Amino acid sequence: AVGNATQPLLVVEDSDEDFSTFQRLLQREGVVNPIYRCITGDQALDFLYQTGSYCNPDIAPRPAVILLDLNLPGTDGREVLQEIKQDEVLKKIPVVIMTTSSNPKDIEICYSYSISSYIVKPLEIDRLTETVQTFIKYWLDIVVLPEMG
Amino acid sequence: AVGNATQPLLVVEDSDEDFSTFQRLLQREGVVNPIYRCITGDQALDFLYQTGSYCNPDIAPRPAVILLDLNLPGTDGREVLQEIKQDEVLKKIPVVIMTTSSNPKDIEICYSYSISSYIVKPLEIDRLTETVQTFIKYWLDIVVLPEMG
């Protein structure tokens, strides 16, 4: 097994296939971190702020790490990121951007807000596997995360 | 070979043993990224601002990623971090903290001061090797770094 059962990973991904492929890869590595999924940006913000208008806050723990796609239905990931980095508490949570966008503008803006890192989703299974396996080792095993952020 | 020869890694580390062993691990893995080392906070700032002795941008290109130790001679890492994060251009460079300090205060505050991730220095060569190998894969191969050129 790998990871910490007390450090949730919030994955904001609207593609069911992308999420499923990702989830299965984490399961093959024995990751124990609980995975929470949001499909829209509106859900992501509600979940993080524990607003309770779209998600019950009682079953929405603060994540230790956030995997965020810039492209999302409703409020998009770009707007989610900007809002997050303006909050004294949420801005501390490591945010890893994982999207199909390789646009120089998105990369530049994201890093300007000090995202932790930017990852372009690779199409190839071998490359995606290496990407996810490394993400797991780095974030869930090596790095010291803030107390939930 | 691994990495990109046009994406420099700036390592702010005053420990000769820690730096030299780190560089040797990168060379053993075939990393082609140029490695620039600064030994004090003031020196790192001069390099990043391209002032003082690092007056020629062609000689001191902007690094694509920074590995910083919080403990440094004179202006310490904490002060260096806060300063570059206030600069329009430099704030885009991801900063990875790799230090001996494992105290909650530095960790919480560092994440508050916009770092990408925090890594506590391993004591045994076996774990250090594995840790650095993951650092290499993640930062120099997987992640899309900001365009600092």
User: What's the number of CA atoms in the CB half-sphere (13 Å) around residue B142?
Assistant: 27
From B131's Cα to the closest Cα of chain A, the distance in A is: 7
Distance in angstroms (rounded) separating the CA atoms of residues B3 and B148: 16
In chain B, alpha helices (H)? 16-28, 41-49, 77-84, 104-112, 125-136
**Residue range(s) defining the domain that contains residue B8:** 1-149
Instruction: Decide if B44 contacts B38 (C-beta within 8 A).
Output: yes
Distance in angstroms (rounded) separating the CA atoms of residues B82 and B113: 6
Least CB–CB distance from A108: residue in B92, B107, B120: B92
CATH of the domain at B65: 3.40.50.2300
From B142's Cα to the closest Cα of chain A, the distance in A is: 6
Fill in the amino acid letter for B7.
Q
Total of domains in chain B: 1
Instruction: Decide if B145 contacts B65 (C-beta within 8 A).
Output: yes
CB contact under 8 A, B131 and A142: yes
**Close Cβ partners of B143 (under 8 Å, ≥ 6 residues apart):** A117, A118, A119
